[PDB]
Symmetry: C5
Subunit: 311 residues, 5 copies
């Protein structure tokens, strides 16, 4: 079968709808997520119009092979979606109501700048390519756009699932293409990061600052260097796959700062020891006493600056 002909020169409108049944496997490192949903399609085919009285039914059911069906695809998918046609209904005026259930792995970039206090807009791009006999344009049927109440993404809060009504019409490979943007907004559940990651990492850093209440060089070396090892080992324990970004992130800046702090603490411990050995205890004592305040104060200030710069 070939596409329905226009009455006049008009393009064929395909009314679309996506209804989320399941969302899962949001992979931060791959920048992908898996979706299981309904894809509803609607268009007019006058060749399928009938008289309900002379035919004996109010609705007609067809097998996909029996009628012409627009070839709809997703742009940002890894491999083509897994689809099962659920229903094909034709109304007296020739209106076709198509419904399929599909599953797909969607490629959608993420912004890590505010991780782990970030929000993301996931995109699902629907596309149709025009045929020789006529142009095909996509539209959104808002009554057929939504999500199941029990839809969840582990580690995320689902904000909304909507579609940008106006399609993007453009030329690709010498034909017109009609593209729709379906948007899934999510915000990361940051709660667990506080007791699990941030607080223990700060405790380890605070342990190193005890070296400012000790004049024992051997003990101070153990304090600063062993806490540095504990910090690295803790980071191995707690690490999750985050991809390499061409921009600076909030977490990246803090982590770099923590390393810088271990380094400066070694400098202080080295300087305090050298001055004592070189018969200058007054200088050594005033540097250590200032460090007791300078280290937590500079750390608190830098964090406020970073929090302000990123949020």
């Amino acid at each position: 079968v070939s596409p329905p002909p226009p009455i006049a020169d008009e393009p064929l409108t395909v009314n679309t709808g996506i209804y989320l049944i399941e969302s899962y496997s949001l992979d931060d490192c791959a920048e992908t997520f898996k979706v299981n949903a309904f894809l509803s399609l609607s268009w007019k085919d006058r060749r399928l119009a009938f008289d309900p009285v002379r035919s004996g039914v109010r609705v007609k059911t067809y097998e996909p092979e029996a009628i012409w069906i627009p070839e709809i695809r997703f742009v940002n998918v890894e491999n083509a979606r897994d689809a099962d046609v659920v229903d094909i209904s034709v109304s007296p005026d020739g209106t076709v109501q198509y419904l399929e259930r599909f599953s797909a792995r969607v490629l959608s970039p993420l912004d890590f700048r505010r991780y782990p206090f970030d929000s993301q807009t996931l995109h699902i791009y629907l596309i149709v390519r025009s045929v020789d006999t006529r142009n095909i344009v996509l539209a959104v049927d808002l009554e057929k756009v939504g999500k199941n109440d029990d839809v969840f993404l582990t580690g995320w809060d689902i904000e909304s699932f909507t579609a940008v009504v106006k399609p993007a019409n453009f030329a690709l490979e010498d034909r017109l293409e009609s593209k729709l943007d379906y948007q899934l907004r999510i915000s990361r559940q940051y709660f667990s990061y506080i007791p699990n990651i941030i607080l223990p990492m700060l405790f380890i850093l605070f342990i190193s600052w005890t070296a400012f209440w000790s004049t024992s060089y051997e003990a101070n070396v153990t304090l600063v260097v062993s806490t540095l090892i504990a910090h690295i080992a803790f980071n191995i324990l707690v690490e999750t796959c985050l991809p390499k970004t061409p921009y600076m992130t909030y977490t990246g800046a803090i982590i770099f700062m923590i390393y810088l702090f271990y380094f400066v603490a070694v400098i202080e411990v080295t300087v305090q020891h050298y001055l004592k050995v070189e018969s200058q205890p007054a200088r050594a004592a005033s540097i250590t006493r200032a460090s007791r305040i300078a280290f937590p104060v500079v750390f608190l200030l830098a964090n406020i600056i970073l929090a302000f710069l990123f949020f």
Copy 2:
């Protein structure tokens, strides 16, 4: 072929049954489990009724293509099930007995609050979407619901496999959906956690408390900081992928408390040393002596409170 028509207006009843053959890959991180089972279906189609005397047969066998079959799907699956039709039998009255063997990856959320002493109810939701001509409703054949004796889930005790008899009937995209809840009750085998994880982790923490029987600051620094490293290294060794939860868990609270305890132990060691150096040994001695009791007592008390709050 379209669905069988009704006698009066009554909906078509599809009698369901799921029999577990294999259960495997219960992934705590992904909150999924794989299942290999039988799906039995039964309904009556009058258009299939025959005279056994004329036909010379008491039962008729059909290929799926030859007859109308209800489109049954699973709600909480990653991809649509891989199914192999085993048998289709039609009796003289038009009763169809359908049987398939299928494999599916099921998405079912887990409650980690009581991990590793948790129990879970895994769900397998069966669904049917109604058609234009008639409404399709699902029913449970509790007799045809079971599991093979050899069915095992590594690390779990399988309690029961059943279904909630009453289906959930609701509207979705202008059509009725009939949903059945099949429930697989499991409880975690916690035994191994005691010698493998809990006891060695406690031993490492108890080692740090020996610093309260020593006035050597250099030895105490090594004790507390090196045990903190041992704790982290031990946690790397025994870790399993638990996902990040928006709620506090029993294990999460304990682990945080263990870090807090290493931190407070450093504080004590720092304070005891500072008072000795600042010519106050009486204060330093009474703080260390109180710590010998305060540390195990507060630890035992906090654990009882947490165990009470979570169980």
Copy 3:
């Protein structure tokens, strides 16, 4: 097509055979193994019997579609096997000789109690479900059961590949099922565990016992605590994915004992130091001197008890 009818009321016997070509990927954690083999099937169909006089051919070759073939499946597989029909031969009396080459991922539970000195019996369960007209029973053709000489399983010694001749006949989903048990006996190659894992782990433990020849508390703390870190780090290096078991294992008991030994060694080091500081060197000296013998002796004794208890 439909099954061959019986002459008298006798069930149809399907003579089976499995011949191993390749065995691989024995996954201890998943409790699965992959197999590549031949599945030979043989049964009698009188409708296919032909007179060798007015025909021409000695044996007739058929395509799977042309004739009735029993639906044979594996019980303990993840997904249905990938099979390629190699040959279908029909002899004058209607004896059908079927041959396929298949690959499958088999789910077979393992007993870890004696790991790494364990032996396992891997099972491949063949099954047939009976039909409306007649009952189907499985049998073993011993001349068609075996394995290729080159068959190897990395890390294991293949003892034998046999079948339990008597099938297990039972009811399931209102029909008779005939199940055969094919057994692949294997024993773990434990050799490498001795130089790679056991010996270095013992050396690390023996290092901690040197603390009984030293009265230096600072050195003893480093000895016991740093060896505990070395032990944990070594275990991270050599670990393999053994699953969590509801029973105690030989390795599990030894590893727990090693942790207990590090703990008791800290106790001793703590006690020896405390007694010296509390003007009791005689007691401290006799505890350390006894520990020099008590630690290796108790360790040797406990190991003998455990080895006896598990073997």
Copy 4:
């Protein structure tokens, strides 16, 4: 069908085009990348020519089976591509315009010599094998070569996607092969390596150099050996799967140098201590004082030499 015959002795020209829709999974370890693209093909088959006036149509649409299609394959793919034919249009002169959407895993070697400041040229080799009746030659339509604006490779800057116009024509197994080289130029986003990896690794090395301002052998041993552990632990934390190369790399040379530096620092600490103990403090003091300058200077010089040799 067989290929269109030649008018004179000329080969059949197949005009090719590749348009990138998605690029993902650039695996440095496997030296592979996944691609989702359009493959456009164009050639003339005179047997397909028609009269538009008689036919009443200006374009003819065909199913792949109905007409002869050149067998185009990729050389450097893991498996054959997953392709979906989108369009086949025939114009009155017999010009065929073919379009498919495909996904493929491409094997393309990477040069690690300049990692992480490297640039790579990814190759996608298109090939056609000639037939008995006629020679098939590939051509590029650079207009039909491009990429979607949203195409991204995590951690890389996509510079260009082009084709080398001249195909490589050669004999293989007694037939002509026409090969086209499609090139995807990428350059690694090195920014993040500076704060995340290089700077913390240098800080850890600088900590070891503080041993040159201390005469305490116990503190110096801890400084050098504990920083060596911190360096190794840090490398475990921030590391990606680079494959083993038969050539020396920039990163490989630097990392080796860092280990050599830890070794020489131990030598210095050992020598300084030995001379002091052997009543030679003047020598010990001058070696340590020279090391304060020698270590950073030699490190800065060697890095300049390496940077010059590799860039």
Copy 5:
């Protein structure tokens, strides 16, 4: 169709050829490698004979379905090769020339005894099972055996790709099988192991030997025990998945020896300290002085013995 009949009772010869296009993913742990190659087949089927004058063609082209094709399989594959048929050419005498491009994961055992200075012979076994009407025998067409110049295996040098001309003909399940051995000779690129693994590991061991130039027990304990931790941590950093072997390997022996050396160094440090404390400094001094030579000498000697025993 069925196989071509014999003129007399001669077997059917199938001339084979394998031409390597790509080789990749040599997995040491799984003992597998992936291959992308051409499989060329040639045999005579007189039923396909034609007169070039009548047909107007000197060569005929067929689709796989249209003619009888020998069922060729690989013995040592995981699943079955997935091939796409490239060409089928029949000459007037009925000589068929078949060509397919395939991809396959091949299971081929590796000898780790000499790792990482090892060489391997990878095998690809081609097989054909004979039929009732006639025996099928495999042959090698040497003009159709080879590899593309660009063929590479990351981490390996490809020496040669050849076939053992004489097939292995044997009986299996009452039928003849004709097996060919295709051999891919490779040698490991060991270069990178020298700066990346061997040299840093030796440096760490040499650091422990500095304890023989120090009488400080506390410093010596830190030296030997902390280097042991560095060694283990380094091994975690550089480790690759070698499988467990029932035989001793060169690398296995060296690694065991390194652990033994750390153990004996602790013994020495323990003995030296004990003798000093037990008023025997002369003995302690001569043991330490002998160790300065004994440790590097015994290490150099044992390595020479091991290198001789393994090479």
